[PDB]
Design a protein around this nucleic acid. Structure first.
Lengths: 49, 92, 247, 57
RNA sequence: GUGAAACUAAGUGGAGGUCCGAACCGACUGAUGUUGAAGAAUCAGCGGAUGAGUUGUGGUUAGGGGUGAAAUGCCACUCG
RNA sequence: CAGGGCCUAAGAUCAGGCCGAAAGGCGUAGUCGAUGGACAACAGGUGAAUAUUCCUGUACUACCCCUUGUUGGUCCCGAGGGACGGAGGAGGCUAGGUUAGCCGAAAGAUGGUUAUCGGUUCAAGGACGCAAGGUGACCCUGUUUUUCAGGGUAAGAAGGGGUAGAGAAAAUGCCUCGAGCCAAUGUUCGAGUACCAGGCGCUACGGCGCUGAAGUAACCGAUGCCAUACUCCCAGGAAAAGCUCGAACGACCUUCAACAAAAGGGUACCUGUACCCGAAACCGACACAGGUAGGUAGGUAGAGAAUACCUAGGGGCGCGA
RNA sequence: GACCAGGCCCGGGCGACUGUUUACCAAAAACACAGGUCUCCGCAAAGUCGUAAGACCAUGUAUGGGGGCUGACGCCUGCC
């Protein structure tokens, strides 16, 4: 009974983990768009500079 | 009630096709075709005025303004309809 | 615990000085944002105890403030006095005994006591003697007044039904905290003041000529013409509640 | 350092919030200015911008 | 080191309105340039460069005024 | 993708309200107002002028339909959160760089020599998961307390959960369970019948056509991520909406209507998009030895974004002899 | 070994100092400064702008807010 509760809390940990990591990676992508340095074509072409 | 954004005389929402060579490139290469519309137009009003007057499912409606004032509309039809067999009927 | 949802947020922007935009309170500008602290001057919860959990630095004040809870679910800030033991319990009310930190109306108390936060009339938040060491004493009471020696060397009979937080208010050691970094005046949002001799006659009345100009006028004046030594700037008939100026 | 040059690359949005038609019509004084512009015969009584598009030319 | 103090080796730490010096900001000397390349700059060095810093964007104070770390300075190459 | 269809700061306009010869001044609710907060796309190709926009691949948002349950649901209200400082240096790694391995070619008329010359590329996203990094509470033992070895506590983490007061959520007080937690990085799919050195066939000699090898390891090491992570200091570091939770009171609609999901399909609002942008196109009247916010930061020598010479890329400064 | 890359010492005057100042002839010994002192102000505060309503002061309360002069620090600051 208790291990199933630990699996429900673990499932809450997976759902909230995927949501928080999704929000974090999208906000990193917005922080790199706002500086003007996000798209890896515009960085991979400017690897030499 | 279902209002549009603006009531804009729907039998005049399209003005003229474009007969440049790049338009024929869009026909043979894109299954799309080129119209000249007025500035007061939509991706919802032009898109309805193609599936009714022509009888063709239109895929997308890529619009742009042109600095002489008038508006240009690249309309891409569905895969089921060739734009070349529907453009020779009009006169392209 | 910062971000208490009691710091109250939106203010008028920094140490402002604009009435219509004209400089009207001079030498202001600069520093941090200095987000204010909405503290509980007028204690509207009487006869319920409350502990003390945090002594937070209010950047708006010269002293500190403290976060006080209650037995019910609330959070307030009050001025903590000198002697605020962490975890000590304060309680406002009408018959609450005298302790360094709690509040009570000015009637139900003896005379000759150290009190910081007093009221000048009923209903107001808190007016007098709330700086970083400002302590007001009581001379004996009267029928509906109370002669109170507030920390200017000044006595004042006052309305007796006024709330008062008994205690000597702490952070006295700002008498000796030196500003010796010499640009720390600018961190408080206080621009440098120019002096009247070294201005022009269009600006100040002591706009001089060659050299360190002597003061020239019969009296040292303000930049708006009034004499700036001895001339008491007080309306002749306002209250007549003060007994003697004693200054 | 810069030069003693006055106008620069300020956005036309902020030039239209100051010298545009709205702050020119929000006062009795500015609409009196438009009495003098329309009374003289100027083809362009304000210097503005547009929130949608740039120029039809 | 004494029953505790006062004080000191040694590390750890990274404070400064600290120092040298780029971007950046500013303009101390000298030469050039004076119908100048430029209605205030070029060249060689120069002062600050974690701050009382610099700058973008959106604003604010308007002339019997504003603003001024105060020069009658600045307020569109115009300011007693 | 950037703004508007979302939100507010400074500030502006301010219904009513106060004031004032007029014009209008003050000021609350409210509404505008990005330089901020919220929200979903990357790689290759095409191309006289367009590419996160067009084609192809894999995705992700916001609603509808299709299946299970519910009788209430939405908004206003109550709350959490959004939500924030400066400096400091140490870790863990990525981006880039160098070297080595591998693959292809190479005789470049010189004394010798292959020691030489080019590739060694891959994103967003979907899954699985984190240590020798930080965090996890107290005491003894061994070691420089430390990385670790060992014992005990019943709270001592991320987190949940019960209650008690006028107490739905929250907050406060009490009790209990949980030894782990956090995030860059990472493996696989995407992803090769792509890209790519080379050779193979014609030149409008401007390029197209067919085929295609290896595509790994280690040392450095970021000013980029972890990271609003810790430590220190005073000069004490925005607001609102989106989001999440929830009783009473208040407005509306009610059964195949509303709400919450699980796969699968459908649908995709306006404006900006060229070009110059350390400038001949902007601002200095000039195709003016001047100015203009921000981003990317290769090699060698060097502490270094100075300096000297160079790869990429771009020029030879629009009078010459 | 190129480019790059502190000249220093001994005295004195002034200003303690870092800074700010006359955009386009003066960067200073000038202004500011930390510190000192006098003086006004009890909150319906003083002071400032406005005929007024009102606003800054200040969502602060004499250890605070104006205003005058002097300018760290050390010794003092006499007579009328």
């Amino acid at each position: 009974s208790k291990l199933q509760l630990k699996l429900e809390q673990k499932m809450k940990m997976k759902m909230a983990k995927k949501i928080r990591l999704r929000r974090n990676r999208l906000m990193r992508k917005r922080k790199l768009r706002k500086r003007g340095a996000w798209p890896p074509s515009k960085m991979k072409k400017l690897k030499n500079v | 009630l279902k209002y549009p954004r603006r009531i804009l005389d729907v039998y005049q929402i399209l003005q003229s096709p474009i007969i440049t060579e790049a338009a024929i490139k869009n026909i043979a290469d894109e299954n799309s075709l080129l119209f000249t519309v007025d500035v007061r137009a939509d991706k919802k009003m032009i898109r309805e005025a193609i599936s009714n007057f022509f009888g063709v499912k239109v895929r997308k409606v890529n619009t742009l303004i042109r600095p002489d004032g008038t508006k240009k509309a690249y309309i891409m039809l569905n895969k089921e309809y060739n734009a070349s067999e529907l453009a020779k009927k009009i006169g392209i | 615990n910062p971000r208490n949802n009691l710091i109250s947020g939106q203010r008028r922007c920094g140490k402002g000085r604009n009435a219509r935009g004209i400089i009207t309170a001079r030498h202001r500008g600069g520093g941090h944002k200095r987000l204010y602290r909405k503290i509980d001057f007028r204690r509207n919860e009487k006869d319920i105890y409350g502990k003390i959990v945090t002594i937070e630095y209010d950047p708006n004040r010269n002293a500190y403030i403290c976060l006080i809870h209650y037995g019910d679910g609330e959070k307030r800030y009050i001025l903590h006095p000198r002697g605020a033991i962490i975890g000590d319990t304060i309680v406002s009310g009408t018959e609450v005994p005298i302790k360094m930190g709690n509040a009570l109306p000015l009637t139900d108390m003896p005379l000759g006591t150290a009190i910081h936060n007093i009221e000048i009339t009923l209903g107001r938040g808190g007016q007098l003697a709330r700086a970083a060491g400002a302590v007001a004493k009581l001379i004996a009471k009267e029928g509906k007044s109370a002669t109170l020696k507030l920390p200017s060397g000044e006595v004042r009979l006052i309305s007796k039904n006024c709330s008062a937080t008994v205690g000597q208010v702490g952070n006295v050691g700002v008498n000796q905290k030196r500003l010796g970094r010499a640009g720390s005046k600018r961190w408080l949002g206080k621009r440098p003041v120019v002096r009247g001799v070294v201005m022009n006659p269009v600006d100040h009345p002591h706009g001089g000529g060659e050299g360190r100009a002597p003061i020239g006028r019969k009296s040292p004046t303000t930049p708006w013409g009034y004499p700036a030594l001895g001339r008491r700037s007080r309306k002749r008939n306002k209250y007549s509640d003060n007994f003697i100026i004693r200054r | 350092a810069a030069l003693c040059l006055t106008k620069r690359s300020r956005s036309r949005k902020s030039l239209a919030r100051t010298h545009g038609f709205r702050l020119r019509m929000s006062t009795t004084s500015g609409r009196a200015l438009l009495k003098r512009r329309r009374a003289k015969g100027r083809k362009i009584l304000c210097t503005k911008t547009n929130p949608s598009s740039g120029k039809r030319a």
